[PDB]
Design an enzyme around this catalytic site. Structure first.
Site, PDB file in Angstrom:
ATOM      1  N   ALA A  76       0.800  -1.219   0.000  1.00 37.89           N
ATOM      2  CA  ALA A  76       0.000   0.000   0.000  1.00 37.89           C
ATOM      3  C   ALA A  76       0.832   1.267   0.000  1.00 37.89           C
ATOM      4  O   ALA A  76       0.253   2.352  -0.010  1.00 37.89           O
ATOM      5  N   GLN A 126       2.755   0.958  -4.300  1.00 34.18           N
ATOM      6  CA  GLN A 126       1.910   1.277  -5.444  1.00 34.18           C
ATOM      7  C   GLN A 126       1.549   2.758  -5.514  1.00 34.18           C
ATOM      8  O   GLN A 126       1.178   3.230  -6.594  1.00 34.18           O
ATOM      9  N   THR A 165       2.976  -5.531   7.476  1.00 31.79           N
ATOM     10  CA  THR A 165       4.177  -4.961   6.885  1.00 31.79           C
ATOM     11  C   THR A 165       4.198  -3.448   7.002  1.00 31.79           C
ATOM     12  O   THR A 165       5.244  -2.857   7.284  1.00 31.79           O
ATOM     13  N   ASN A 205      -9.313   5.171   2.296  1.00 38.02           N
ATOM     14  CA  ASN A 205      -9.792   4.845   0.966  1.00 38.02           C
ATOM     15  C   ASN A 205     -11.272   5.145   0.789  1.00 38.02           C
ATOM     16  O   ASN A 205     -11.737   5.210  -0.354  1.00 38.02           O
ATOM     17  N   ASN A 263      -4.141   6.668  -6.308  1.00 36.06           N
ATOM     18  CA  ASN A 263      -2.737   6.902  -6.018  1.00 36.06           C
ATOM     19  C   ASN A 263      -2.285   8.221  -6.617  1.00 36.06           C
ATOM     20  O   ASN A 263      -1.506   8.961  -6.011  1.00 36.06           O
ATOM     21  N   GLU A 293      10.327  24.996   9.442  1.00 42.40           N
ATOM     22  CA  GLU A 293       9.632  26.173   9.930  1.00 42.40           C
ATOM     23  C   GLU A 293       8.121  25.983   9.872  1.00 42.40           C
ATOM     24  O   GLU A 293       7.393  26.717  10.545  1.00 42.40           O
TER      25      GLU A 293
END
Lengths: 68, 430, 98, 425, 439
Positions: free
Chosen positions: E12, E15, E145, E206, E228, E254
């Site tokens: 995720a 991609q 993961t 999503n 994406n 900043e």
């Protein structure tokens, strides 16, 4: 026929990979896919037949006939 | 005038000298059949006809590795009597080389060497391309390094040799044989290029991506590590050095005379295009433990001297700053009696890759030479094997058979006891 | 109209003694173009997917015969088959090929 | 690097018939005696197993001796038997039976003075000889008679060579001879006095190789003569062809023998597969290495599990890599390190050649030493107890005055060979 | 000289980056193969691609990205795709077995193997940089993961580098839309990192992009290609004060001292103002005063929460295109006169502005429209505390009878952290409460 190799580090199957050895991965892979698609030296340490029919000439002039 | 004769002994010395003397005919303009279509008289002679003939010696006691050279590949290059052959191989023991089969041609290595000694206006040293684990490379070498020091003596000594690996082993009882030269080197050595095979099946597996390599994948790189040492006599540069110059630094005591080797910039034919290849990176690529040419970690020990020799496009001001980066790091350490501990030489020519080879056409090269006291821990494990065999007294039966009494065995321990003792004494705070 | 293919084993041929190369089944000669996508893993080939079945006319002495991608050369036939071809097809004597 | 190859008994006229086909297969020689081979790297150094003659004809350095002419009529009758020396078949008339004591002593002594002549005639026709080969019968009377005679008979002339038998040896399953158990006891005793490289061969394992790793249903002798015919020329692969890690049988014997009392060997041969299933196997280095260390590929009919090895040797013949060898010899030394010993810090030496043989591309040969071969000499020691105390078949063996004290000291020293297990395990 | 490292862990995140480095290469003249075209050009001074790209002396460009995952099938698409000449082939780091959404298979048994290797590229990239200002890690909260192996990676960077910024970008679990079953376990277990090691960990879900795909763009049934490509535009907008010179530029430290009020409120959202299709594009005005209050719609927020259920502690408006600084002062007062928009009592200024000069770019084959003025809008708010409230209600019903647990304890994970991470997460929802009040 360029760009015909897999990138180094590729994990998926490549055919004939396990039969062409001694190099890194893309130079194995390009040939894997192309497969998937006068007188002898004196002081000699060796054998020369024609050993016996000799008298009186140097080694190169003797063995020039044996190489040709 | 800057002449050098270096010797090849054993199974290796023809085979390593296949790929060492590959390059010195390639660096210059020399054809392999004796011709060229100045500074070429460092590794060559000259004939008034025009033919070029080299000068080095090749010993192996069976003919076929020297008949590899004597057949069609390299016929017209070498001298026909610097290729001398026995009729039976010395075969995994010191006895047949040093004592019995060597005598019919040890006075054939010495009517060539001395006839090639007295056709050079200068000379700088004797250097040996031999092999520790053999019966010729530790038999016929210690028939010649002990014998030239009777004649010539005070001239320089170096040894490009092949060492026993920690884990990988080729022969069986050779650990016992290894100690049949550490008796003799430590009283007559001033340099040692210790090299294993397991560490260059891995340098060739990390930097190159070549898993599972061969010898011709390997032996062409030893042919490179010599040529950044003999570069300075062969070609000019900004700071030319000589064969007596590095030994003035690199041997500190009568008992710390054991440097190492490291060829720093090594990469495939592909990754170099995406690589920047900077001076500031291939000076601190040398020091990491995965770049050593032997399986040794330089953390737990120390460094004594560091010799560097450059090649190609090198300016000195970034090298003078690349060093000052290193000595302020403290992942590596130093002994407190050596505050200077560095040397840099530079030439102008760039390296040369062989056609059909496995390395990149680079315009830079670095050789890192380092005396290391962590070699004591490396000499722990090889000679630890002696105790596990001498208790049960294996193979002393045929050892005593052809002329080597047990006196050789007792001395060897009492050499290594004092050799492992002084390396403890050198690292302590004074 | 089914075909069976039997292996002839010689003494000391180094093969496992399996009597059959192919089980007794009806053999398709030509498949319909759409039958390339037929799920042969779950369904048997029906009369709808086969354009032409192998007939007794397709087996001829001295001709190659392609079954399941293997090319068989028919070199002889038994006396009954020889008589049957003479009676049914009017073919002249089918000489054995050496 | 010349080689002397002595052939006595019927087996030595039957193994060595099939030996001298392979070493005339590889050098490309027809049985008329002329060079009709492929490349010119095999005529270069033709001398190791073979010799020159006038007119271009080629004639070997062969010795084949026996007493009855019921063996050397079969050598000359074969296909490749016409090349052999007509003066090595020095034939007697009255053949021996099963006791060897009439073979070498009575019937051999008129003939061994012709055997010792042509051997000394061979030695003066060689330039730099290296060793002493033999293939004969340990339970067959003419071989254990007139070959084990010669083991004590050229050692006197030449003590500076290497003795390397290719020996058959008795076995549990059957008696092809009732005489061979106590016939072997003294001939094996003469070996321990003198042997260096003893290649013990059986007939269970060479009828178990033929039924589980070759799947072959009616094995004659000509199957079993050829498999041991491969492992002879498979160990001297370096003296006649070039390579990258050459070897001789001094390079062999430096690594292999640690003590002067345990030095008995056992052979092998690696790339073995059946004729039907040749296209299913993957013949590479990682599989030949796994195949050559087990129990099912050993030609000496003993299991290497209940006896640890000490020294192991191999060779390969073809172009390959060497990291694939040196890690895989280091696999089996530490994947199962309970089958070696902790006072020998290495056990494996290997060697390479250049030219693979006709019909293969990657060939190999296994040579081994272990401590389970004492169980092979256990059974002959076991049978002697049931036979001696009843003085069983003795009158053929006291037949000319050879005493019972020649019998009592045999097992009195064959316990000592298995009493050298105490220094090992 | 203004550099940043861009790590991509799990499917995720990887991609996302396959469409991010399209977007970076299209901003400049660089082709896929790295060679400048030398024929046509978009003009610009040199040393402008530095902050994401290295530059060999040959002339190729190398990204400052490392693509690490424990399964091979997502990276092997890239090694044979169309961007193979882009990367360095030892950046692409691959394992054998994936985490299977098990935190204990990416932090305790399988993930320990690569973590000695993957820090030797963060070490190797960083010393090749002159002055460096932080990191860009792209993980996801719901996976073993993305939320397990990130904690292994990010603990090592805090003990090595410490004070340098880490700019995570993590998909957050949605109310109704979900795919895994153990997602409430994962996202409440990686919140030890955002407690301690992070600096700015932004959120997407999503579910909310589906509606802004549906109404604003003319999209029914959106793919994950369209997800994406919209996300990286937010990423490519915060990093335009590096690769370009703007009229009122904002540094990458900043803004950290105005967008993060206290050391525990560092979780702001994102919004992209003009997102339209090519056949409603030229039928509207697009002004500065129009695309500023189009940021504060309920329907344009990147994460499906209610912005009206809380307070905006700090917002940082980033502008790019033909925007003059009088217009931004016109539109900030128009917002601050409004009352359905909401303030903070102890934050009088409230807003930070940034104006640039290079317009948004369009990818051919893409779905966006070509406009001249674009605004990304990053806002801190307490609207996200109620999103933590719904996820912890989805977690404790699992743990009330130890459902699904024994697959975690089988790889060295203890039960002790499941209790601790709940109470440590519990200490977060009061810290939005106890500063959101008045005097």
């Amino acid at each position: 026929d360029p760009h015909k190799f897999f990138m180094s580090g590729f994990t998926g199957y490549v055919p004939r990979a396990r039969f062409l050895f001694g190099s890194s991965f893309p130079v194995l892979t390009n040939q894997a896919l192309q497969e998937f698609g006068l007188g002898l030296l004196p002081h000699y340490g060796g054998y020369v037949p024609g050993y016996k029919f000799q008298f009186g000439g140097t080694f190169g002039h003797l063995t020039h006939d044996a190489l040709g | 005038m800057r002449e050098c004769i270096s010797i090849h002994v054993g199974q290796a010395g023809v085979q390593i000298g296949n790929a060492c003397w590959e390059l010195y005919c390639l660096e210059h303009g020399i054809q392999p059949d004796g011709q060229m279509p100045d500074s070429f008289n460092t590794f060559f002679s000259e004939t008034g006809a025009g033919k070029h003939v080299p000068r080095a010696v090749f010993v192996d006691l069976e003919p076929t590795v020297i008949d590899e050279v004597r057949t069609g590949t390299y016929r017209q290059l070498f001298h026909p009597e610097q290729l001398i052959t026995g009729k039976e191989d010395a075969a995994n023991n010191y006895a047949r080389g040093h004592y019995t089969i060597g005598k019919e041609i040890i006075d054939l290595v010495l009517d060539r060497i001395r006839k090639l000694a007295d056709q050079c206006t200068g000379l700088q040293g004797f250097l040996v391309f031999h092999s520790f684990g053999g019966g010729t490379g530790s038999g016929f070498t210690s028939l010649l390094m002990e014998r030239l020091s009777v004649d010539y003596g005070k001239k320089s000594k170096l040894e490009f040799s092949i060492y026993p690996a920690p884990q990988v082993s080729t022969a069986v009882v050779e650990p016992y044989n290894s100690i049949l030269t550490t008796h003799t080197t430590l009283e007559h050595s001033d340099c040692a290029f210790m090299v294993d095979n397991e560490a260059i099946y891995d340098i060739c597996r990390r930097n190159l991506d070549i898993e599972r390599p061969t010898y011709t994948n390997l032996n062409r790189l030893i042919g490179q590590i010599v040529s950044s040492i003999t570069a300075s006599l062969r070609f000019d540069g900004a700071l030319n050095v000589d064969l007596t110059e590095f030994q003035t630094n690199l041997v500190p005591y009568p008992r710390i005379h054991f440097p190492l080797a490291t060829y720093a910039p090594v990469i495939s034919a592909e990754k170099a295009y995406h690589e920047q290849l900077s001076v500031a990176e291939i000076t601190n690529a040398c020091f990491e433990p995965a770049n050593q040419m032997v399986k040794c970690d330089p953390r737990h020990g120390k460094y004594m001297a560091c010799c560097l020799l450059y090649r190609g496009d090198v300016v000195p001001k970034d090298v003078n700053a690349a060093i000052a980066t290193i000595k302020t790091k403290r992942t590596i350490q130093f002994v407190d009696w050596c505050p200077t501990g560095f040397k840099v030489g530079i030439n102008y020519q760039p390296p040369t890759v062989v056609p059909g080879g496995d390395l990149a056409k680079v315009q830079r090269a670095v050789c890192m030479l380092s005396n290391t006291t962590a070699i004591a821990e490396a000499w722990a494990r090889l000679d630890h094997k002696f105790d596990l065999m001498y208790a049960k007294r294996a193979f002393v039966h045929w050892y005593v058979g052809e002329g080597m009494e047990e006196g050789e065995f007792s001395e060897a321990r009492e050499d290594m006891a004092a050799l492992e003792k002084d390396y403890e004494e050198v690292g302590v705070d004074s | 109209d089914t075909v069976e293919i039997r292996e002839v084993h010689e003494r000391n041929n180094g093969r496992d003694p399996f009597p059959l190369l192919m089980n007794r089944q009806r053999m398709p000669k030509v498949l319909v173009e759409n039958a390339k996508n037929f799920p042969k893993c779950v369904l048997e080939i029906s009369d709808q997917e086969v354009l032409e079945w192998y007939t007794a006319k397709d087996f001829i002495v001295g001709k190659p015969l392609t079954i399941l991608g293997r090319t068989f050369f028919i070199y002889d036939c038994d006396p009954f088959t020889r008589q049957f071809y003479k009676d049914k097809f009017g073919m002249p004597d089918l000489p054995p090929v050496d | 690097r010349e080689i002397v190859h002595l052939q006595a008994g019927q087996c030595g006229n039957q193994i060595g018939a099939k030996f001298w086909e392979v070493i005339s297969d590889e050098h490309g020689i027809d049985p008329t005696g002329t060079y009709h081979g492929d490349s010119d790297l095999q005529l270069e150094r033709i001398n190791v197993y073979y010799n020159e003659a006038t007119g271009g004809k080629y004639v070997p350095r062969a010795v084949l001796v026996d007493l009855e002419p019921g063996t050397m009529d079969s050598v000359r009758s074969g296909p490749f038997g016409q090349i052999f020396r007509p003066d090595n078949f020095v034939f007697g008339q009255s053949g021996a039976g099963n006791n060897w004591a009439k073979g070498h002593y009575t019937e051999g002594a008129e003939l061994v003075d012709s055997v010792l002549d042509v051997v000394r005639k061979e030695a003066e026709s060689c330039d730099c000889l290296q060793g002493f080969q033999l293939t004969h019968s340990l339970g067959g009377g003419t071989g254990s008679g007139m070959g084990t005679l010669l083991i004590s008979k050229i050692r006197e002339e030449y003590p500076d060579r290497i003795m390397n038998t290719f020996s058959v040896v008795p076995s549990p399953k059957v008696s092809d001879t009732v005489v061979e158990p106590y016939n072997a006891t003294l001939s094996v005793h003469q070996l321990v006095e003198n042997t260096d490289e003893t290649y013990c061969i059986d007939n269970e394992a060479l009828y178990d190789i033929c039924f589980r790793t070759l799947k072959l249903t009616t094995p004659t002798y000509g199957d079993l003569n050829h498999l041991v015919s491969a492992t002879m020329s498979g160990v001297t692969t370096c003296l006649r062809f070039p390579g990258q890690l050459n070897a001789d049988l001094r390079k062999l014997a430096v690594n292999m023998v640690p003590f002067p009392r345990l030095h008995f060997f056992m052979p092998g041969f690696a790339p073995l597969t059946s004729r039907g299933s040749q296209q299913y196997r993957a013949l590479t280095v990682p599989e030949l290495t796994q195949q050559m260390f087990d129990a099912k590929n050993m030609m000496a009919a003993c299991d290497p599990r209940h006896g640890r090895y000490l020294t192991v040797a191999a060779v390969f013949r073809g172009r390959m890599s060497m990291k694939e060898v040196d890690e895989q010899m280091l696999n089996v030394q530490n994947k199962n390190s309970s089958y070696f010993v902790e006072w020998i810090p290495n056990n494996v030496k290997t060697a390479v050649c250049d030219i693979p043989p006709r019909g293969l591309k990657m060939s190999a040969t296994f040579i081994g030493n272990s401590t389970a071969i004492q169980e092979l000499f256990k059974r002959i020691s076991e049978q002697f107890t049931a036979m001696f105390r009843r003085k069983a078949f003795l009158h053929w063996y006291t037949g000319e005055g050879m005493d019972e004290m020649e019998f009592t000291e045999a097992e009195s020293n064959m316990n000592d060979l298995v009493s050298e297990y105490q220094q090992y395990q």
